[PDB]
Amino acid sequence: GEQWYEKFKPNCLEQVAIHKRKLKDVQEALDAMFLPNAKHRILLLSGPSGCSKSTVIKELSKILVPKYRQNKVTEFRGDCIVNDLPQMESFSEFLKGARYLVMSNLSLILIEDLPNVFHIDTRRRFQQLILQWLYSSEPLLPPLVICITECEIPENDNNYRKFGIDYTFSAETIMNKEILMHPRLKRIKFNPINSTLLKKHLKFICVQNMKMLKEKNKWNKRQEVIDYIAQETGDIRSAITTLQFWATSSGSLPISTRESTISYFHAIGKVIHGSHSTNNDNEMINNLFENSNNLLSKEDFKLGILENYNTFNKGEFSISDASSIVDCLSECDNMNGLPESNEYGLREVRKTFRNISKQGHNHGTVYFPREWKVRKLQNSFKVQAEDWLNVSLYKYNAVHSFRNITLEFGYYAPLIRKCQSYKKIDVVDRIGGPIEA
Amino acid sequence: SLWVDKYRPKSLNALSHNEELTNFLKSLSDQPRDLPHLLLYGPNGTGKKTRCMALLESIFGPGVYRLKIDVRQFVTASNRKLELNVVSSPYHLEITPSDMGNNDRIVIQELLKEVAQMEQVDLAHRYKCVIINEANSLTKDAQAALRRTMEKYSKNIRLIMVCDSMSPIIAPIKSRCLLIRCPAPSDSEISTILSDVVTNERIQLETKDILKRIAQASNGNLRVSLLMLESMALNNELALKSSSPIIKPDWIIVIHKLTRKIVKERSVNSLIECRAVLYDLLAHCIPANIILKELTFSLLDVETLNTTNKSSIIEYSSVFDERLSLGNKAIFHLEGFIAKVMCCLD
Amino acid sequence: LSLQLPWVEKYRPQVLSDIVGNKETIDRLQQIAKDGNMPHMIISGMPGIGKTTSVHCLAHELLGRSYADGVLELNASDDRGIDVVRNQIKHFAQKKLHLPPGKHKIVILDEADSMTAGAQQALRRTMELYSNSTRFAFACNQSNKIIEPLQSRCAILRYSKLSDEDVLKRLLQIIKLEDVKYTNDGLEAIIFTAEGDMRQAINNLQSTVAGHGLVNADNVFKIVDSPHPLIVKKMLLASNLEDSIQILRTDLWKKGYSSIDIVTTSFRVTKNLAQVKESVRLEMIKEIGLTHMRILEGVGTYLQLASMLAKIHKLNNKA
Amino acid sequence: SKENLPWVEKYRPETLDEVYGQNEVITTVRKFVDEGKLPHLLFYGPPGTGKTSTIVALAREIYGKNYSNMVLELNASDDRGIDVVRNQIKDFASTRQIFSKGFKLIILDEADAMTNAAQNALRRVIERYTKNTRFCVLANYAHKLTPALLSRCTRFRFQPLPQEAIERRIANVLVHEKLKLSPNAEKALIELSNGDMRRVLNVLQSCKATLDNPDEDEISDDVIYECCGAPRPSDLKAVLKSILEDDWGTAHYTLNKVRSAKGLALIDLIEGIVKILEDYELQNEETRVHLLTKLADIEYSISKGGNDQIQGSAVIGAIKASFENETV
DNA sequence: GATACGAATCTTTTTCC
DNA sequence: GATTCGTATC
Ligand SMILES: Nc1ncnc2c1ncn2[C@@H]1O[C@H](COP(=O)(O)OP(=O)(O)OP(O)(O)=S)[C@@H](O)[C@H]1O
Ligand SMILES: Nc1ncnc2c1ncn2[C@@H]1O[C@H](COP(=O)(O)OP(=O)(O)OP(O)(O)=S)[C@@H](O)[C@H]1O
Ligand SMILES: Nc1ncnc2c1ncn2[C@@H]1O[C@H](COP(=O)(O)OP(=O)(O)OP(O)(O)=S)[C@@H](O)[C@H]1O
Ligand SMILES: Nc1ncnc2c1ncn2[C@@H]1O[C@H](COP(=O)(O)OP(=O)(O)O)[C@@H](O)[C@H]1O
Ligand SMILES: [Mg+2]
Ligand SMILES: [Mg+2]
Ligand SMILES: [Mg+2]
């Protein structure tokens, strides 16, 4: 009659498929924001889909909020198209009415379904309003719990503007730099449910459906299928849905679960060190491109390969292989985003690292490319050069090109001004700061 | 003011390093009415801009050197605000379209087609020149607007664009301009200019050899040599000796240190350190083309390398310079060049 | 000018018993039809293998006389923005309709792979709030385009490519119901040119019948063209360069195929191509990419394609 | 005023009997019309092979008089985004037919210029309103069409025009314009056409314009080559012979002299030499690889422009070097 | 007591609401 | 995907 994941919802936090450390680290935080004069204004939970975030919040607000109620959860409804109110004001009205939940009223807030953040205006409104909540001058506020499901937005009609929410729906691409780095903000990233918890809970669902399971003689096989489901996915709801589909069926239907997306560093490691259980490089790269073309079709991926190919055996491999890798990357850079470029580059990197991979290798740790740092440094240089050029006209009539500023006037003119400073003009230090090594 | 600007020749008769080019400029400026479109090409720092300004003074008289700077706003396809600085004097205009990136086409269209159609009648009609510094940095889309702009509206505007190594300039633009070659001064002329500068500046000079040293170290760069002269003048209490060190820019020293490291230690970790150095160089907005050029010509000055290694280095440098021309990210090609060099040296 | 429905829509199955191919999936769908507890499901596979027909047949066999106001079929041709999702889907799900005991409303979302992400989030809210009264059936070509939060709630059913036997059986049914004369080799040729597509097989059979009558190999191959991916694979795997050049010329250039189409098909073939080493495969991919760039810049002559084949033979022949 | 038009859009066929070359496509679409059943067509082929002509003639034959209100034609010149497909096409193929009855036609000329969103929307319009509307999709590049859109369409391939079709159309035009044409001129025109009829008509118009008195004088191959500015086959053979047999200095001199005699371009010579060499029986196989790779590189560089003398000497050197493997 | 497992880290700058 | 460290269990 009802879905298995809906009729088998845990009744207590002992029944929830969560790690012990995760439960402790969410309970301690939730108590921390509950006490008056709490340091943490809001709590942000982030992770994949169906990692039992909402469930633990339900039970924790069930056995925590009553303790601090003086003499439940309140969720935002984006579907509430109320009369006389624009859509962008719905969250404003909700937050204004939900802040009146302090005295004689206590209800933890769960923002499970966010407002539409793909529209830039209302996304910015969301940022500004949650910042106003964070920086609020109110004496105290009810605790704010926001759950974000990290999912990759797949490709669609070729028009992408935000560049953050248009490639990945995550807390980093929704919330800005100020919001996440805040003393009063607490963030607990979640992890997929491990195979042990999945196996135990699927066994519990089976031992609660023995008659039907025994009716269709599928109980002599349930253990292998439970292990297979636990190994395939880290999603509790999807695992239970697949188990229900298998149990209620009467045939030899293959057990198929939703495919989980591959992260950035996951893809980098798969390109560098290969993938276990797939000794075919061709098929692994093919599946990587079909499933994660959004991540692989970018300049950031080639930059990551260039930055992290030296982490194979702590740079202890032949220079010929490194030259081949960088040569192929440079050739791929001359194809302007054609699919053949990415395919050839990744295939060549994988082949090069396969021909040199053996046993006894101790690899390093990959890192994100530092290109954004160089862009910020170049922007600071541009600002300083503009300032120097501005000073270099009204003080004395002279127009100098920017190339000369980068070449000679960024070093010789500050040197002259420093000598003039010692035997005595605004710009006395070197442009872009000193160089080292 | 710097000694490069303090002693800039303000007249066609005040240029005293090429002579024959000055005679050609005077021949051009004898009858300004039929002046064609000009393209000044020559090594960096030889004095092309000074020659353009001297020709403009010869035509329009003194007053071309009264530069007024104003910021004019643009709008792109995505409707972002861009601010180009237009150094404007009477009788001529200065524009550096490279101040914007690939978005210089909208400048070359809006700003230049505005003045091309706008006549200069005040019953008498004059043609106002427009100077385009760094004509190489145009992106083959600004030049395509440029060609018809100056072909059809020649009656009202004249184009004088300065550049070095005019190979990235398209054939339609080159065919539409008078090609003026500006060679770099010899060491004797640089030394003579420096002698005049020190004489007018009351710097105590031990011997004249230390001016030939400046001229040789600047590699035919008048501005670079004058900046070195001022640097050692203000770092030696206005008294220069043969012990006064030849000072070179910091990035040149960094590139030479990188060359020494590349020749000495050749491993993947050395490659990573070289990548860090290259990223530091790029953080100082030093263009990757000149980074590769200086790296190549410092690696060809190492005496421990035989002819085979040097030939391999120059071949790889040419290949990766062509790659850098057609590329989008410089670090790929810089790292590839360094890796190829480190793989060929051993 | 007259009235005669094409065989593709005249013979579209109306019951789940007439759908060929994935026997286990269709049997499961029949079980869902009889018991009636339909879960949220996602249907994905190649085009023209019975995905839309399976969904609509399941809806009919599940709702009966209540199909008129029991399904809300929304497709790519219809507007499916965030506001449309919210308003229409919410009002349909909130509509209290008395159904048989084990029955639910069905919301068919065909071409769900072409839906905006925010609309998918609104679908998440609607799916998790009104699940007790209505169920969702997604029809798509690839399940990647459906966000993970929506795939979490659905029972994924994957439709495999139709085998030659199933398509042959359906072709025989249509033939013995339309009275067309045929030959065994003709039906074999129709099967071969269909390449696992039932709609293409029906279209080719109808075209052959209309154009020539009797369906033999000669008529079919004189009206329909052999799949050019197979010709591209034949030309890429040729032993010597002369044979590859001759195949390219006489089978793709004289036949009137665009050079960009040849290059793109060559890349797609090279991606899925066994019996070749990884180094050789990636070298072929690189050469195909360079030739693709030359084609894109305007140099799309036969000389460029011949040169690409020559470079491929250099790399794969140790030449 | 059909005498005030270019020859290409003056001899555009008005009836299906005037579309030459594509015998099978025309026969099958005529059978579709006769039987009263028309599927969703897809016409694919090279440019100037008779796709728009065929579809317009077919629509005129189906709706002789109601053509204005029975056919909706869209092409690349009209915006065809998601909104256009959603509104205009759906509302046209959602309303009852004019006059007594029939099925509405929606022709999509140059449908490879449509975005994937528009095609994805169009597929359900095709599948849903097929009872009273049929689609025709015209495309030169099939890789720009979504696989679903290709699935729900009946594919008809337009081959490049054979010799006989071009000869028949040439005869028709010569009769219409009171022109003459030598058999050698006919062969030259056939070879330069490369399966395109627009090229034939344009060249013939230029040949009539070249002649001093187009009522008495004929058109020979000399006029063909002079007006179209192409190298004669004899010139190509002479240049190749000089490159293969003679030494470097005389080969370079012969190339320059042949080029300057009639102002020939180097790309035309390259294509002619490639066509000649494709018939050559090479015995080393590496002779072909080197020829193809080097000549493709030279052709690409020529396409980007540059030094003509350098490129010509490069052509000579590439040919002589490759033919070194032949004797090996 | 061995060992497999699990957690953290490895990330910063044409079309629709 | 790799490393390191820490658990928990058998
Ligand atoms: N043993 C279990 N432990 C936890 N959740 C369970 C269990 N069995 C079934 N469930 C269900 O699994 C679902 C998991 O939902 P949550 O992960 O808490 O929400 P979520 O993380 O926001 O998922 P998304 O991202 O919205 S798809 C809930 O609907 C639970 O009722
Ligand atoms: N298994 C099948 N059995 C019988 N007819 C089929 C089968 N698969 C497809 N067809 C025919 O194909 C047409 C409808 O196919 P659809 O199921 O609508 O294609 P599809 O699977 O939805 O692919 P897309 O993604 O919608 S293009 C009708 O003419 C059906 O008769
Ligand atoms: N089969 C043919 N018979 C007679 N004339 C033809 C034929 N094919 C093309 N032509 C001529 O070519 C002209 C233009 O060709 P069209 O068929 O209208 O263009 P097209 O075939 O659609 O090619 P594209 O794809 O639009 S560039 C017509 O006006 C005719 O004069
Ligand atoms: N004939 C000359 N006599 C004295 N100084 C000169 C002469 N020619 C050039 N210079 C000096 O060279 C310096 C830089 O030259 P510049 O015109 O900037 O070269 P470029 O046009 O290549 O940028 C100027 O400051 C100018 O003073
Ligand atoms: Mg939840
Ligand atoms: Mg369908
Ligand atoms: Mg057309």
- Whether C contacts D, i.e. 3 or more CB pairs less than 8 A apart, is yes
Claim to verify: residue B160 and residue B15 sit in the same structural domain: yes
D neighbour chains, 3+ CB pairs within 8 Å: A, C
Interface test with C, best of A151, A243, A260 (most C CBs within 10 A): A151
Per residue, what are the HEC states of C270-295? HHCCCCCCHHHHHHHHHHHHHHHHHH
A neighbour chains, 3+ CB pairs within 8 Å: B, C, D
What is the distance between the alpha carbons of residues C67 and A132, in angstroms, rounded to a whole number? 50
What is the distance between the alpha carbons of residues A87 and A91, in angstroms, rounded to a whole number? 8
Claim to verify: residue B74 and residue B113 sit in the same structural domain: yes
What is the distance between the alpha carbons of residues B2 and B230, in angstroms, rounded to a whole number? 8
Claim to verify: residue D147 and residue D249 sit in the same structural domain: no
Q: Residue A341: CB partners within 8 Å, gap ≥ 6?
A: A332, A333, A335, C289
State how far the alpha carbon of A130 is from the alpha carbons of A35, A39, C148, in Å.
Answer: 21, 16, 26
Q: Residue C136: CB partners within 8 Å, gap ≥ 6?
A: C40, C41, C106, C107, C109, C123, C127, C154
Instruction: Locate A83 and state its tokens.
Output: 């009369």
Q: Is residue B133 part of a domain?
A: yes
Instruction: Locate B34 and state its tokens.
Output: 């039929």
Claim to verify: residue D276 and residue D236 sit in the same structural domain: yes
Q: What count of CB pairs under 8 Å joins A to C?
A: 144
Q: What is the span of the domain harbouring residue D189?
A: 162-230
Instruction: Locate A209 and state its tokens.
Output: 């459906």
Q: Is the CB of D228 under 6 A from ligand 3?
A: no
- CATH number, residue B256: 1.20.272.10
A328 → chain B, closest CA residue? B336
Claim to verify: residue B151 and residue B16 sit in the same structural domain: yes
Ligand 5 center to C126 CA (angstroms): 13
Of residues A187, C74, D82, A409, the one with CA closest to residue B226: A409
Instruction: Locate D213 and state its tokens.
Output: 């008195």
Please state whether strand E lies within 7 Å of residue A71 at its CB atom: no
Domain boundary among D126, D161, D196: D161
Claim to verify: residue B137 and residue B67 sit in the same structural domain: yes
Q: Is the CB of D11 under 6 A from ligand 3?
A: yes
Claim to verify: residue B221 and residue B164 sit in the same structural domain: no
- Note the ligand closest to the C-alpha atom of A8: 1
A356, A325 in Cβ contact below 8 A?
Answer: no
Question: Per the CB < 8 Å rule, is D46 touching C258?
Answer: yes
Claim to verify: residue D277 and residue D293 sit in the same structural domain: yes
Please state whether strand E lies within 7 Å of residue A357 at its CB atom: no
Q: Closest nucleotide to A118's CA, by C1' atom?
A: E17
Please state whether strand F lies within 7 Å of residue A19 at its CB atom: no
A134, A42 in Cβ contact below 8 A?
Answer: yes
Residue ranges of alpha helices (H) inside chain C are 7-10, 23-35, 51-63, 82-84, 90-94, 117-129, 148-151, 164-178, 184-194, 198-212, 217-223, 228-236, 241-248, 259-271, 278-296, 302-316
- DSSP type of residue B305: S
CA distance A348 to chain C (A): 7
- DSSP type of residue A193: P
Across B16-99, where does the E strand assignment appear?
38-41, 68-75, 81-89, 92-95
Phi, psi (deg, nearest 5) at residue B52: -60, -45
Claim to verify: residue D189 and residue D324 sit in the same structural domain: no
**Nearest protein residue by Cα to C1' of nucleotide E9:** A365
Claim to verify: residue D109 and residue D151 sit in the same structural domain: yes
Torsion angle (degrees, nearest 10) of CA A9, A14, A17, A22? 130
Claim to verify: residue D19 and residue D157 sit in the same structural domain: yes
User: By alpha-carbon position, which residue is closest to atom 17 of ligand 3?
Assistant: D50
The bases of strand E with some atom under 7 A from any protein CB are 5-17
Claim to verify: residue B204 and residue B170 sit in the same structural domain: no
Of residues B203, B200, B255, B196, the one with CA closest to residue B232: B203
Q: Is residue B93 part of a domain?
A: yes
Claim to verify: residue B192 and residue B309 sit in the same structural domain: no
Domain boundary among D131, D161, D191: D161
- DSSP type of residue A194: P
- Whether B contacts C, i.e. 3 or more CB pairs less than 8 A apart, is no
Q: What is the span of the domain harbouring residue B207?
A: 187-240
User: By alpha-carbon position, which residue is closest to atom 16 of ligand 1?
Assistant: A52
Chain A residues touching C114 at Cβ < 8 A: 156
Phi, psi (deg, nearest 5) at residue C97: -125, 125
Number of H helices, E strands in chain B: 14, 9
Claim to verify: residue B133 and residue B79 sit in the same structural domain: yes
Q: Give the gyration radius of chain C's Cα atoms.
A: 24
Q: Is the CB of D21 under 6 A from ligand 3?
A: yes
The tally of domains found in chain D comes to: 3
The response to whether D180 counts as a known ligand-binding position is: no
The response to whether D69 counts as a known ligand-binding position is: no
D279, D294 in Cβ contact below 8 A?
Answer: no
Pocket test for ligand 4, best of B46, B222, B226, B230 (most atoms within 8 A of CB): B222
- Whether A contacts B, i.e. 3 or more CB pairs less than 8 A apart, is yes
Chain A residues touching C116 at Cβ < 8 A: 118, 156
- CATH number, residue B210: 1.10.8.60
Claim to verify: residue B177 and residue B191 sit in the same structural domain: no
Q: Is residue B138 part of a domain?
A: yes
- Note the ligand closest to the C-alpha atom of B11: 4
Question: Per the CB < 8 Å rule, is C222 touching D24?
Answer: yes
Please tell me what resolution, in angstroms, this structure has: 2.9
How does DSSP assign A105-138, residue by residue? ---EEEE-S----SSHHHHHHHHHHHHHHHT--S
Token pair 């020539």 is at which residue? C212
Task: Give the nearest ligand 4 atom to B162 CA.
Answer: 21
User: By alpha-carbon position, which residue is closest to atom 7 of ligand 2?
Assistant: C50
Which 363-422 positions of A have CB less than 7 A from strand F?
363-366
User: By alpha-carbon position, which residue is closest to atom 21 of ligand 1?
Assistant: A50
Domain boundary among B141, B158, B181: B181
Domain boundary among B166, B181, B196: B181
Strands B92-95 and B81-89: antiparallel
Chain D residues touching C79 at Cβ < 8 A: 86
What is the distance between the alpha carbons of residues C109 and C85, in angstroms, rounded to a whole number? 11
Chain A residues touching C123 at Cβ < 8 A: none
State the first-to-last Cα distance of chain D, in angstroms, to the nearest integer. 66
Domain boundary among D138, D161, D184: D161
- CATH number, residue B136: 3.40.50.300
Q: Is the CB of B220 under 6 A from ligand 4?
A: no
Please state whether strand F lies within 7 Å of residue A275 at its CB atom: yes
B166, B135 in Cβ contact below 8 A?
Answer: yes
Claim to verify: residue B193 and residue B161 sit in the same structural domain: no
Token pair 């495969």 is at which residue? C281
Torsion angle (degrees, nearest 10) of CA B239, B240, B245, B249? 80
Claim to verify: residue B197 and residue B332 sit in the same structural domain: no
Across A52-211, where does the E strand assignment appear?
73-75, 108-111, 144-149, 185-189
How does DSSP assign D262-315, residue by residue? HT--HHHHHHHHHHHHHTS--SSSHHHHHHHHHHHHHHHHHHH---HHHHHHHH
> In A163-195, which positions are buried (b, 16+ CB within 10 angstroms) versus exposed (e)?
ebbbbbbbbebbbbeebeebeebbbeebebbeb
Please state whether strand E lies within 7 Å of residue A404 at its CB atom: no
The response to whether C81 counts as a known ligand-binding position is: no
Claim to verify: residue B8 and residue B122 sit in the same structural domain: yes
Q: Is residue B34 part of a domain?
A: yes
Interface test with C, best of D31, D37, D132, D315 (most C CBs within 10 A): D37
The number of beta carbons lying within 10 Å of the beta carbon of residue D84 is 16
Claim to verify: residue D12 and residue D155 sit in the same structural domain: yes
Claim to verify: residue D139 and residue D107 sit in the same structural domain: yes
Bridge-partner residues for B88, per DSSP? B68, B93
The response to whether C190 counts as a known ligand-binding position is: no
The response to whether B44 counts as a known ligand-binding position is: yes
Pocket of ligand 2 (CB under 6 A): C 8, 11-13, 19-21, 47-53, 141, 170, 198-199, 202; D 148, 151
The tally of domains found in chain B comes to: 3
Chain B residues touching A423 at Cβ < 8 A: 234
Fill in the amino acid letter for B127: Y
D121 → chain A, closest CA residue? A157
